[PDB]
Amino acid sequence: GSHMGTVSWNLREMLAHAEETRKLMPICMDVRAIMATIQRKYKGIKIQEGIVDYGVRFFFYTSKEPVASIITKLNSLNEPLVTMPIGYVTHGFNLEEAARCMRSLKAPAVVSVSSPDAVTTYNGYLTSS
Numbered sequence: 001g002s003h004m005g006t007v008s009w010n011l012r013e014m015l016a017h018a019e020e021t022r023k024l025m026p027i028c029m030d031v032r033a034i035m036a037t038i039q040r041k042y043k044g045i046k047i048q049e050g051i052v053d054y055g056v057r058f059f060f061y062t063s064k065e066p067v068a069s070i071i072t073k074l075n076s077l078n079e080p081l082v083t084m085p086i087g088y089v090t091h092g093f094n095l096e097e098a099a100r101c102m103r104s105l106k107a108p109a110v111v112s113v114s115s116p117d118a119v120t121t122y123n124g125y126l127t128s129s
Contacts, residue, residue: 001017004080004110005111006119006122007112009112015038015041017082021080023080023082024057026059028061028090029047029060030063031090042058045058049061051077057079074109075104075105078106080107081107083109084113085098085113086098086105095122096125100125100128
């Protein structure tokens with residue numbers, strides 16, 4: 001596994017993949033349901049805002065940041081990623097706006113969705129004809 005592009009994975013598969021690939025994984029802190037999951041496994045890490053290299057190369061972020069700025073902070077690093085879309089539900093965004101806003105990323109990343117049929121939809125927007 002080396003390519004990018006959208007998939008339909010869960011938190012488990014993202015975490016697993018991120019471990020194996022050593023690739024970066026961003027996490028919206030706001031989603032305390034994800035925080036608990038990660039904090040259970042990775043407990044010796046105190047959650048901090050920003051890069052937390054501990055086991056998996058995490059990037060915890062605040063949903064109040066503009067999708068734009070938060071993307072730019074990944075773009076600076078230029079590191080390859082795996083996550084679900086950065087301005088989606090985690091910004092109150094629709095999947096279309098999410099893709100549009102997330103095209104402003106300049107680092108090569110895996111995206112996710114909640115189901116396999118949504119993959120082709122979201123990728124559709126990442127072409128934008």
